[PDB]
mmCIF file of C-alpha atoms and ligand atoms in Angstrom:
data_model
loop_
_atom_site.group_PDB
_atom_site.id
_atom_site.type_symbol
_atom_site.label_atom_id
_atom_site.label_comp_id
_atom_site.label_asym_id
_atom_site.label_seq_id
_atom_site.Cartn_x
_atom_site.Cartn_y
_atom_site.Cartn_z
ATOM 1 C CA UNK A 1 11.565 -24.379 -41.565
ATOM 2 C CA UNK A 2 13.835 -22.802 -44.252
ATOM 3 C CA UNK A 3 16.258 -19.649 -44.295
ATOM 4 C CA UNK A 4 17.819 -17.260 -46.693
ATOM 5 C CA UNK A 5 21.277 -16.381 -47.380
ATOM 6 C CA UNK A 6 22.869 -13.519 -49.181
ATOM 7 C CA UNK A 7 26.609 -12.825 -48.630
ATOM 8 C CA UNK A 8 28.153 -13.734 -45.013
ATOM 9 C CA UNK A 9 24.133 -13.620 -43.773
ATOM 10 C CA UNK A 10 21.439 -15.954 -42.666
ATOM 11 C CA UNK A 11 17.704 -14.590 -42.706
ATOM 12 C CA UNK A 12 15.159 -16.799 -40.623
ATOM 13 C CA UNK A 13 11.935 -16.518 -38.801
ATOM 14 C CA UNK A 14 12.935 -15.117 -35.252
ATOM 15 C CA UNK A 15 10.880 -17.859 -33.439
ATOM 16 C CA UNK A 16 12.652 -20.837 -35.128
ATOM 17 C CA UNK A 17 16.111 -19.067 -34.586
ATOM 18 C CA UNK A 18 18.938 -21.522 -33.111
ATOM 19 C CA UNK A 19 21.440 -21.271 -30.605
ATOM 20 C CA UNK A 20 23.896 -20.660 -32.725
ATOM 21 C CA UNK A 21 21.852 -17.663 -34.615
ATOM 22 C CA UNK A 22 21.351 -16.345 -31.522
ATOM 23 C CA UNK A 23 25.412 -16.474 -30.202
ATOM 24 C CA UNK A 24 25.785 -14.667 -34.076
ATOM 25 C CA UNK A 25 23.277 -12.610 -34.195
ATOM 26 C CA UNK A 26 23.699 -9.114 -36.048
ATOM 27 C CA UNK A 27 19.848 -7.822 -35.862
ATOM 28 C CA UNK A 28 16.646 -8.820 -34.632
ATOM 29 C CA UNK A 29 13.326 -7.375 -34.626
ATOM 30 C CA UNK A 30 10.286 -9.181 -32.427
ATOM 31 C CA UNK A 31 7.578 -7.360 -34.485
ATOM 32 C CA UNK A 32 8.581 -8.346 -37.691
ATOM 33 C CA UNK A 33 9.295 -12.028 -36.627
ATOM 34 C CA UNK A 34 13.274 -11.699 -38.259
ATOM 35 C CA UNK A 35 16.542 -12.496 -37.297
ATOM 36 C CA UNK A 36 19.707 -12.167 -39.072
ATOM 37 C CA UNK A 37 22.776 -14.234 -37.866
ATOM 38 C CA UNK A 38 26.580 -14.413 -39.789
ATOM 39 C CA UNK A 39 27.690 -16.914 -41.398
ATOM 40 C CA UNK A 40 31.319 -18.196 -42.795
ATOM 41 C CA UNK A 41 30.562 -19.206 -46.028
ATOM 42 C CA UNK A 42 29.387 -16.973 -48.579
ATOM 43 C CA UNK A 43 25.210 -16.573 -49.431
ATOM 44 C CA UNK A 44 24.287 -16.404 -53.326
ATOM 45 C CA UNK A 45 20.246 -15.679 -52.776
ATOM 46 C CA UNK A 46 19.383 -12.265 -54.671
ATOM 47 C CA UNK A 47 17.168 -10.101 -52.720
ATOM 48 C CA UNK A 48 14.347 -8.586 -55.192
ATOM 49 C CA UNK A 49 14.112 -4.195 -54.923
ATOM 50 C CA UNK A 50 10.929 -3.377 -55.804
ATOM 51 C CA UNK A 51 7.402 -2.968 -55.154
ATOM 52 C CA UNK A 52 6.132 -6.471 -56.890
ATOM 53 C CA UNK A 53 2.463 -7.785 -55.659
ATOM 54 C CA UNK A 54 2.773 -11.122 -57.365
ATOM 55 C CA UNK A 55 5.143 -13.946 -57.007
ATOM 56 C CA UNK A 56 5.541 -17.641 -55.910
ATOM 57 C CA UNK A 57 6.090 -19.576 -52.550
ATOM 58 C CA UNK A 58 7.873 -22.659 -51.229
ATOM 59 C CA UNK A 59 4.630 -24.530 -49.079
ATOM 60 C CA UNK A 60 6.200 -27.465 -47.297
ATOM 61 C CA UNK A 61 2.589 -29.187 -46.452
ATOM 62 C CA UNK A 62 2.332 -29.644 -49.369
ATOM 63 C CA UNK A 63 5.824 -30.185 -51.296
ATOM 64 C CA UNK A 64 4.832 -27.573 -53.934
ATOM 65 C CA UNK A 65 5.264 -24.001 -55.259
ATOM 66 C CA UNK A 66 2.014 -21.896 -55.412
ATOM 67 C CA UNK A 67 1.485 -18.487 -57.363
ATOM 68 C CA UNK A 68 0.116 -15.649 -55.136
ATOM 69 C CA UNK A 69 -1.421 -12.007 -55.478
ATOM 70 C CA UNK A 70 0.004 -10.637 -52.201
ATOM 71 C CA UNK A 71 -0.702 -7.390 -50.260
ATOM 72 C CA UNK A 72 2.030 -4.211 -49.367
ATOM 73 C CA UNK A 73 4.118 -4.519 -46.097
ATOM 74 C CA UNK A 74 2.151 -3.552 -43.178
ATOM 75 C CA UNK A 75 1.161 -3.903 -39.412
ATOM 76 C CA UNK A 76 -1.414 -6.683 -39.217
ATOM 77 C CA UNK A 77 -2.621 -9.149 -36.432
ATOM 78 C CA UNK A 78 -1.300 -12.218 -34.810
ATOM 79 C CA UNK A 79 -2.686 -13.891 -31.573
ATOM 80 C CA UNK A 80 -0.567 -15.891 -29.428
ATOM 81 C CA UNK A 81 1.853 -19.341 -28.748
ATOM 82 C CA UNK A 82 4.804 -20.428 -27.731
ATOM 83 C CA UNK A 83 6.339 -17.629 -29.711
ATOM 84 C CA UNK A 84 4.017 -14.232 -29.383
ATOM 85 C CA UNK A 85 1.318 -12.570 -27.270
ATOM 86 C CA UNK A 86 -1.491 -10.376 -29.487
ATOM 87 C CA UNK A 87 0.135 -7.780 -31.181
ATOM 88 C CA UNK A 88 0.455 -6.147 -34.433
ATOM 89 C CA UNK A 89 3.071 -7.484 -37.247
ATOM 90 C CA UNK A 90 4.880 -5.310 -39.008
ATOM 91 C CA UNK A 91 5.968 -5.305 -42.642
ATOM 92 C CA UNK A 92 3.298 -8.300 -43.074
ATOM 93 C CA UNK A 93 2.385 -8.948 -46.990
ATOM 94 C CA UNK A 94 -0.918 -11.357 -46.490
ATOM 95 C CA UNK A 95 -1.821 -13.499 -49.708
ATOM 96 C CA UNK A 96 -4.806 -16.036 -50.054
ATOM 97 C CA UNK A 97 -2.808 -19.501 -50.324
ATOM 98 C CA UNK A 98 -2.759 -22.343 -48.126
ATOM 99 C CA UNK A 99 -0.245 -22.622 -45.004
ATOM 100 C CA UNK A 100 -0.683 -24.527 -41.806
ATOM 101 C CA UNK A 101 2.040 -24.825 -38.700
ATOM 102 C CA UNK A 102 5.921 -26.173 -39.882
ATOM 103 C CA UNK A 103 5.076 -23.950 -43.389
ATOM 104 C CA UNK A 104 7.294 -20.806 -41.014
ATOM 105 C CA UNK A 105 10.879 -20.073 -43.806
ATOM 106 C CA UNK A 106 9.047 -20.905 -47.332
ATOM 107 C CA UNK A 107 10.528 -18.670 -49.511
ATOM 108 C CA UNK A 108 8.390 -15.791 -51.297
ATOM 109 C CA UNK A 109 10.022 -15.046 -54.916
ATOM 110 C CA UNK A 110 9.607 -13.100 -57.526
ATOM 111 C CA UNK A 111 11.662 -12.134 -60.994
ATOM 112 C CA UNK A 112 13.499 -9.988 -58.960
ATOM 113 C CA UNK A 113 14.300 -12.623 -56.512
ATOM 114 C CA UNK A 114 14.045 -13.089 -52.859
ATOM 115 C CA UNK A 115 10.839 -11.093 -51.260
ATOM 116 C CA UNK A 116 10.057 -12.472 -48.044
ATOM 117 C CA UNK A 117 9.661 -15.928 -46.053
ATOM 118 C CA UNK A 118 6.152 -17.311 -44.550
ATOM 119 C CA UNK A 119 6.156 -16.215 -40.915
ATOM 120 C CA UNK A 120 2.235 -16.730 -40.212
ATOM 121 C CA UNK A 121 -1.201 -17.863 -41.870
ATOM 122 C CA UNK A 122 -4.883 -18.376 -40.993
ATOM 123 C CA UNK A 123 -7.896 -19.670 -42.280
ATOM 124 C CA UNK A 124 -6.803 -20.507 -45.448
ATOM 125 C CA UNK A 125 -4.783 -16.985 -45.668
ATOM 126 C CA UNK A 126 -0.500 -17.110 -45.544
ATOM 127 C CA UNK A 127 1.592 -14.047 -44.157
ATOM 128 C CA UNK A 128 5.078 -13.373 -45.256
ATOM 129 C CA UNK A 129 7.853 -11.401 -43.624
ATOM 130 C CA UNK A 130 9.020 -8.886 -45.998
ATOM 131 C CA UNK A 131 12.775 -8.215 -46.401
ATOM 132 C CA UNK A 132 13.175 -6.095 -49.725
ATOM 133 C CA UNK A 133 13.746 -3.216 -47.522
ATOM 134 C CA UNK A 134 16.748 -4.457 -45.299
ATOM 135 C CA UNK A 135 19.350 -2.698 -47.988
ATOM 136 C CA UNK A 136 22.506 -3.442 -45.591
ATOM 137 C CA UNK A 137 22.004 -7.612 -46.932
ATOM 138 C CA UNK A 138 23.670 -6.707 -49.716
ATOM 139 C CA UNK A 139 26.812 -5.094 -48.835
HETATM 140 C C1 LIG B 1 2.535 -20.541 -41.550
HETATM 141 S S1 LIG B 1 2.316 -20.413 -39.720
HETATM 142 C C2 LIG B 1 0.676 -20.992 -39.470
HETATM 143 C C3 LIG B 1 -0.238 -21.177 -40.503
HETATM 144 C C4 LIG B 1 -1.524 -21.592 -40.215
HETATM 145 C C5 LIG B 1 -1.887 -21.833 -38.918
HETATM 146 C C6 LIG B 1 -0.974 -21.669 -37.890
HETATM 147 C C7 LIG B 1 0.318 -21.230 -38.137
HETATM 148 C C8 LIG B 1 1.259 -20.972 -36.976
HETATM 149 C C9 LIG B 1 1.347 -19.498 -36.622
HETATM 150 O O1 LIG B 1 0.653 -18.715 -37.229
HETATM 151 N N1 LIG B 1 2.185 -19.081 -35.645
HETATM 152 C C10 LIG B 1 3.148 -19.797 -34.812
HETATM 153 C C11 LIG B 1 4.546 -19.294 -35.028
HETATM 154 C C12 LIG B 1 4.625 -17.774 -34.926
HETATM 155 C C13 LIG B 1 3.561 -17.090 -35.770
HETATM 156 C C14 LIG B 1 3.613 -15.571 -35.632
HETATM 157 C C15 LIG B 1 4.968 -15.038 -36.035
HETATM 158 O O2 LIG B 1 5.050 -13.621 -35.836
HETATM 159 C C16 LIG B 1 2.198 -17.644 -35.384
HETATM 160 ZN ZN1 ZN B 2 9.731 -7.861 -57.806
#
């Protein structure tokens, strides 16, 4: 679990999204896992610009922050569950790090600040959701 927020907006992984996200919601995309929802109080997480392939991420199994090499956003695979049948992920940045099931919000960061949030993994591989290109978070 986890979530981002910059300004009067909440970031999380479209699959965990809540009722209330949903009743709020200002834009969704089902490829790219996201949802944004509005929020009352004001969000102080800075969104990194820029093309960075190195950073650190939140891993819950394991109540620690790991540095990762990670790849550019781009349309990758993911098979099925309660969430998704096979299809291809966009804006997917894939890293070697280790991420099982409940590890979906961990938040990607680098000096810039916010890059993405853990949205899927595999054999010993993690996959974050890139936002650095969603430039309407910030105003
Ligand atoms: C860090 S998730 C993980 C890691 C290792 C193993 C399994 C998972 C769970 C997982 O990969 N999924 C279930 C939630 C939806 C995911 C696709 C989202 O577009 C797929
Ligand atoms: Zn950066």
């Amino acid at each position: 679990s986890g979530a981002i927020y910059v300004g009067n907006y909440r970031v999380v992984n479209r699959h965990l999204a809540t009722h209330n996200d949903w009743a709020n919601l200002v834009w969704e995309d089902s490829s790219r896992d996201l949802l944004v929802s509005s929020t009352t109080a004001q969000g102080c997480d800075t969104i990194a610009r820029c093309d960075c392939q190195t950073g650190v991420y939140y891993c819950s199994s394991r109540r620690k922050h790991y540095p990762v090499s990670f790849s550019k956003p781009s349309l990758i695979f993911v098979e099925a569950s309660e969430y998704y049948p096979a299809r291809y992920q966009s804006h997917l940045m894939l890293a070697v790090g280790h991420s099982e099931p409940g590890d979906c919000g961990g938040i990607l960061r680098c000096q810039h600040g916010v890059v993405g949030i853990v949205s899927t993994g595999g054999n010993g591989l993690v996959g974050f959701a890139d936002v650095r290109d969603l430039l309407w978070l910030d105003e």
